[PDB]
């Protein structure tokens, strides 16, 4: 049966004081036991990282970046096993898993260029005969905390950049799918990373708290839900240390009268239902301006939604897999019930998927909910399942007001052919990542990802250029040589 | 008795519910009453900023920067009266005042280049036919909270950049010397700034708290002591808004054997005793390696210290002025008494300056303390007065270990001629701003200021490039155009 | 009669061996005499620049920039007199002159931020204990050669940025309108510029060749006609010095069926006929896709064009002024005769403007030619007058293919509401500066200006960021300190 | 005896109208025949390039960069073979070839970061509701011309970055050692590059002139001698296309009194005599300020120089190999006589190395010349062999004036402990690449390489960030949307 441990100073260790089930959400069956680290075990991770830091701090960027060059190859060689371990515990089918991995590898690609990214600014004669320049030096031991829905990519947002910027890392990944995460961390030792520089510590709140209250932990990167994001951000900030905490979302798309409805519907299938809707960039609300477009959207969407296939990752050619836990399934079903009960139209019901087939695991089918209103709880709250909701509004400004009024502002999209409507949208909308005929406007590895309003806490975003600034601290040197005796 | 009010939506207003004395620290007499804003008056300032934002947000960076161009010249034209105002309330003498104002003008100069500074990064074909780019858009209403020691410069670290980045501003300056701060903000209207974009709200902890608890304030720049910085950071973070908070200092200089001890000592005078040592980059400890240098340092320093002139800003030619308040004066004297009692040699004693001369105001003369050790309370804490302490150590590493071990890590200096020592020092030392033969390694306006350890809270430092990233927020747009119907 | 001199080492001088007439192109009369400098007078200017360079090179960028801060104030203060001078010798009316002046000041504004722009790249630990960094240091004596159509702005593309980058400058402006150019360079001394850093040397081919062949001149920025641009580039390259040479143009605008015609027509008026079309960014060809839009553009263009006013710069409210010379006026009349001969439809005739009114000067009225084809010589060659030609094509791609085929590739535009078409245009079109519903897509001072294909020779464009790189040379230092004796 | 061809559109081809010997310079024997491409053959390569360009231009930077990522691997995988192909024709021993190869791969590593490097600048509201932004789009077909001394690394200066920037490339390498260079170009197809995007066309002046005069070639990167750099720069500039031509060098090192003499000598061994001195960054002149340091330099340098090993690349552990050709050997010998004839002290003589050992190949031993003066021809001119000259001067400023006076200004070094002297030297010295206690201050792949004065023609330097700018063209877009019809309502 076997137990999943911790990666510390290049070794798998296990504490054996407390454990938890990891499941196979397709079958609903218990897969593996996860050892949950207490504060003592987390402190061994931090000691390891802290002990590794001095030599790695002085390790030239080029040499640190060569680890990520080799790490990239290894990610690619082991792609199928990685995807398999993602699939086994998350449930997502090969092509979502391969997409996640690829974007992860892209973060590693970006980090391979650390010497360019770590260039300071040099200034000649700030005064007469006086020079000055900036350096972005390493923080020390950095902590990372990651959610379940991307057990590979979201870690790769953090440790690749952090490590290559000269820090040492302690990762505390989601307990609901830790194998895929640990698998990639172990690859790193093969890629030539010294022992201690990357550590993986599995657990729950106790592990996270220990990271937040250790003085050696100089920075905390968090990606998960807003309620937790906020806790992590307030707590870290209250102990002095720097922090970036990315929260939840309710991504809206405006479908304009001039949009190509076919292309819009085809893209909204993937965006809304891909990865079972368990995405921070999930396109969960379609705001149809007119109807007109409302009717045509719900019509064509219904049609395309019939071809969707829900089932386990063992079957490639499914479109998406199960939800992560029974609890989560019950929550998603709850939200659909709430929508119907508050007056919404369940155009396509997937509460009772029953599509499987030797599976009482945690499945939810693709669901379409029409005539939803801002006073609906299901609209206000993040469902985080395979659900798409439609609001109908009179004008484009009304849809933008509706978006700006929301708690979250992570991601957003406008479908249109008109250049003016696209600029006015991208300029004025109060969300961090904007798409133009792109329902998942995820920034590429060489840009930074981050929402606005309650979707992000902090002033530096995730991965990309901001991660360089977040995983370093500015030192400014001012130099002068008055004593000209030798010359 | 005149009463000092508030700049809100371009007009001087005053609440009159509660006030507080501003002193002329040279004479010790009460000069002026400062009206202290309550939560209602602060909210009026914020409402004025919120109200001005939408149209300032969309004003082109070029046109915003032209307000700073005219602001530059207004600062220069009114330089004498601004230094008078500083001198009147802080106490600092003309040349210190002008130095501050100059470095403040430089912040303005740098802000004049906003359109360069607000460049986003544009990416062609992130996917096939798909472009993407970044924009650093304005925050909204920004709050700024500044200390007494620099009533002009420190404010100019914040609102010029913040405003020219398309935000509106509510400034909350030190209650101890507000006249100068208010004067510069008033010039801003003459420079062509719309009403409400800049506001200045005077007050104490109550006005600060109003700013931290208002949801319309989206960012809070603080510069002050660590204890308060720590509070402001924690409190802002608990209310969701982003924050930078700068804190206290104990700046050390290593004096190496090879250094020209005359250059060192001449440069330590102004660093230790300039602005009466009331400076976040004041060089307050001189670590001498060997002795050897220890003796020579204390010897020459004493001599150079005898030429020092303490006295009011009405006499130019004084090196420095009084300390800010009586409470502070007493505190500074206390640290000197603490040093004495804990074993330190008081080489030059300025507890009893008596140099003035028709002034029982808040004066403390230059003092020199030798043989200080890490266990002394006056070494551990920030004195923030005209005091220089000397510590003696065997090797340069012992000096560096001693610095790294200190609570603060704002600023440091090494005096030497050798290149190896300077790099080893500048690479490894755990402080934010490093000088090689520069006792005040204060970054220029086109760099950013900020300490390490407990001298700063946050990940974006003050003024220059970081201030651009702190007063704006990142939006990434990804663009794609599916149907080519109009083409064909 | 009045003789115009040279500015060499901070003083007006004159050679008086040889001269040329400067006209008032409104009246056709000879206004002043321009002293033409010889290879020996040129060499005096270079000598003055070379002599001023060593101390100017080591002058802090902040101090260099402060000159431009003062220069900006002065150019604004003297704005009326500068526009009057431009108007008197070029002919352009107040508003076009101010427009020129404004854009020139924008270059100056960008120059004021030199310390940022001159930032190198520092790299920590390129190997163990080895650091390296780049410095963009000054060139030395730089030469500038400018055309007639912008006797203020194009010079302000060059010397503001060049001087602030630590160089000294020798300017050789167009001999058709030198007063305005010399006037603004005289303001530079009053701004605090040392003598010799900036110099103006008036002349002809002789003065140019003199600059090209002197080994002390280290970089040449030329802006003018292709044929001369080519010669300058070839000649400077042959002598071993670096060079940027901007040449001619024939800017097209695609008018798609989904375009707002009222808006396109209204902006084409100023783009085609502004500054009497004597503009490197002048939009001289409107390519209508379909007709449909052809018919509609010509219809609305015809109507708006009836309200145009041609005349002398003494009457403001004139839309544009005369052409630069009698020769050039004959040339332009020729380009319009051709178009009618070779078959085109002269929809609005301005050949015989006869609009003035006490002026047998060099006036051409706004003209509109319709049904022009690629074979017509008047389509192939740059007219450089107030003439707008309309070519009709079947599809957008035909338009783009037509544009890409042309010799030049300076500037271009597409009028459309559709984003797909805009990106596909902006992405694939083979021209440097592309506008979307902007028939004059002139980059602002914080960008750079430069065309593709035959419109430009070199690899770094004018003003903006490319100019920092053109006016400085890369140095890379690599630093190591093998011995740690003193530290230990 | 095999015939070396050309890589055109992903295939080996050979014209067979004219050929030339490539030697093994250790033995002095003709190894291989190099096919020389004529203007018709070059034009095929340019046509392959131009044909492949449109799709390659529109390929995303990410996808283009992944070719360089895969290429990174192949180069390291075939590292021994590449080093053998360099040793076989240039003559340089394993470690110098590996050194060369490693710096080249470094240039590949940098190119992998294309997406970051190709970021333009975006500006919001340059006027009211008007945005503008820059783009650095590809040139088209780009031509590269490289020297004999670095047949691997110098080509990696050019085509990795050029290709990843959206261009197609035609490479004309040195005819003296072409096998390594073709070998590395052929690994590029396996790394997933589309046919035609990279081309190698071997030849002499005729192939060079074909590239310069063909209108489809939009940019030319030349690395080589000053005379030819000047020719290439002039010619290119006459035919409208942009160019960067890097040239010769006379690299001086100022040995100050306070310098660590043991460290300087030890570092000056590799810098003077490494790769048999046949290096643009070869430190050929030591300027001893005082003597004092003159005497102590020559003393210690003579001693350490006794342990040098000259021989064939077959014996690893040799410090350096032969010179490239018999003609070049005679030239190098020549300059040493010339120095002796004009009054200079030949402290260590390597004219008659006679160290090999079954080799009448093109061998010159490490030589030291002392008491050289600015008036000597051997000092004015670039020797480009294993020869270290030492000038004596009174003061630091005299050493600096001497350097600035020289024709070349490629690279320089100063040995000192003092910070004031380092800065003053690095600030004021009129050469492009400056070292502080580093005799070979070669910029890393994330920087750019380029001398001053006559060592470089152009304004953008080799590899690094400048290559991004040289291998692209700036486009500025200004955008406005005047009609809000669809947004309303
Ligand atoms: N905005 C973004 O960047 C982004 C991107 C992708 C996913 N997400 C988020 O991921 C979330 C789903 O993943 P999840 O359910 O694992 O997220 P979560 O909110 O539970 O947080 C993830 C991590 O926080 C820890 N955690 C949970 N409860 C805690 C508590 N009470 N105290 C301390 N730590 C605690 C977990 O152990 C886990 O490692 C979604 O709500 C979604 O918003 C956000
Ligand atoms: N970047 C630098 O500064 C640098 C670096 C390394 C080497 N070098 C130089 O490289 C040179 C040695 O190599 P080389 O002898 O092969 O260099 P070279 O100057 O002869 O030129 C090398 C290349 O140019 C071509 N070529 C030669 N003669 C030509 C002519 N007359 N017309 C047109 N093309 C011609 C060759 O075919 C070859 O590809 C040295 O002089 C050295 O200064 C310069």
Automatic annotation (TrEMBL), chain A:
User: Which top EC class applies here?
Assistant: oxidoreductase
The protein's UniProt keywords, in alphabetical order, are:
NAD, Nucleotide-binding, Oxidoreductase
In short, the EC number is 1.2.1.27
Residue ranges of every copy of the Aldehyde dehydrogenase domain listed in the record: 15-477
Spell out the CDD domains in the cross-references. Answer: ALDH_F6_MMSDH
Q: Where does NAD(+) bind?
A: 146, 148, 172, 175-176, 205, 225, 280, 382
Question: Superkingdom, according to UniProt?
Answer: Bacteria
Tell me which Gene Ontology terms the entry assigns under biological process.
L-valine catabolic process; thymine catabolic process
Q: Which GO terms describe its molecular function?
A: methylmalonate-semialdehyde dehydrogenase (acylating, NAD) activity; nucleotide binding
User: Which Pfam families does the protein's record reference?
Assistant: Aldedh
Looking up PANTHER family in the UniProt record yields: MALONATE-SEMIALDEHYDE DEHYDROGENASE
This chain's protein is named methylmalonate-semialdehyde dehydrogenase (CoA acylating)
Q: Which organism does this sequence originate in?
A: Oceanimonas doudoroffii
Query: What is the gene called?
Result: dddC
């Amino acid at each position: 049966m076997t137990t999943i441990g911790h990666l510390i100073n290049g070794q798998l260790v296990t504490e054996n004081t407390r454990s938890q089930n990891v499941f196979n959400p397709a079958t609903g069956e218990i897969g593996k036991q996860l050892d949950l680290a207490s504060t003592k075990t987390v402190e061994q991770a931090i000691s390891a990282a802290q002990h590794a830091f001095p030599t790695w701090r002085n390790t030239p960027p080029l040499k640190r970046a060569r680890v990520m060059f080799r790490f990239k190859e290894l990610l690619e060689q082991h792609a199928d096993e990685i995807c398999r371990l993602i699939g086994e515990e998350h449930g997502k089918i090969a092509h979502d898993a391969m997409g996640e991995l690829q974007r992860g590898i892209e973060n590693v690609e970006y980090a391979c260029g650390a010497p360019e990214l770590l260039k300071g600014e040099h200034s000649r004669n700030v005064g007469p005969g006086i020079d000055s320049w900036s350096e972005f030096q390493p923080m020390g031991v950095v902590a990372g905390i990651t959610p379940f829905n991307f057990p590979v990519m979201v870690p790769l947002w953090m440790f690749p950049m952090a490590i290559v910027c000269g820090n040492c890392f302690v990762l505390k990944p989601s307990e609901r799918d830790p194998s895929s995460t640990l698998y990639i961390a172990q690859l790193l030792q093969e890629a030539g990373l010294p022992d201690g520089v990357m550590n993986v510590v599995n657990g729950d709140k106790e592990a996270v708290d220990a990271l937040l209250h250790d003085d050696r932990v100089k920075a905390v990167s968090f990606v998960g839900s807003t309620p937790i994001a906020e806790y992590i951000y307030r707590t870290a900030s209250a102990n002095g240390k720097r922090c970036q905490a990315l929260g939840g979302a309710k991504n809206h798309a405006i479908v304009m009268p001039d949009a190509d409805m076919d292309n819009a519907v085809n893209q909204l299938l993937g965006a809304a239902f891909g990865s079972s809707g368990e995405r921070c960039m999930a396109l969960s609300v379609a705001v149809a301006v007119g109807d007109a477009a409302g009717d045509a959207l719900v019509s064509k969407m219904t049609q395309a939604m019939q071809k969707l296939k829900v089932g386990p990752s063992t079957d490639s050619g499914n479109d998406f897999g199960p939800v992560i836990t029974r609890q989560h399934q019950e929550k998603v079903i709850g939200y659909i019930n709430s929508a119907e009960q508050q007056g919404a139209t369940i155009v396509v019901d997937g509460r009772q998927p029953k599509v499987p087939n030797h599976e009482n695991g945690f499945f939810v089918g693709g669901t379409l909910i029409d005539h939803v209103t801002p006073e609906m709880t299901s609209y206000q709250e993040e469902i985080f399942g395979p659900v798409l909701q439609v609001v109908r509004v009179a004008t484009m400004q009304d849809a933008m007001d509706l978006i700006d009024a929301h708690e979250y502002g992570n991601g957003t999209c406008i479908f249109t052919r008109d250049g003016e409507a696209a600029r006015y949208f991208s300029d004025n909308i109060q969300v961090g990542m904007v798409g133009i005929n792109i329902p998942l406007p995820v920034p590429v590895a060489y840009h930074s990802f981050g929402g606005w309003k309650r979707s992000l806490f902090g002033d530096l975003h995730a991965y990309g250029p901001d991660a360089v600034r977040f995983y370093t601290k500015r030192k400014t040197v001012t130099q002068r040589w008055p004593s000209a005796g030798v010359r």
